[PDB]
Symmetry: C3
Subunit: 29 residues, 3 copies
């Protein structure tokens, strides 16, 4: 159960970095 | 404490989902 | 361990708030 949450937040960190990069692209057209 | 962090992480997941939705609508719509 | 995960999830919340504001910027030009 603790391990599951840790993996979850790590997945979220991954997804978030992906979104940040995608938004940087879209910002620039 | 456990409940609080689990709820926070889950909210973050929902929010990330909502933002990627909005990003897709901006990019394509 | 617990404190580091709380710190991480907090940093993720901050980053997601920044990204929401940025997406809203782009929705408006
Ligand atoms: As988290
Ligand atoms: Zn930039
Ligand atoms: Zn630029
Ligand atoms: Zn808006
Ligand atoms: Zn507006």
């Amino acid at each position: 159960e603790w391990e599951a949450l840790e993996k979850k937040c790590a997945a979220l960190e991954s997804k978030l970095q992906a979104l940040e990069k995608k938004l940087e692209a879209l910002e620039h057209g």
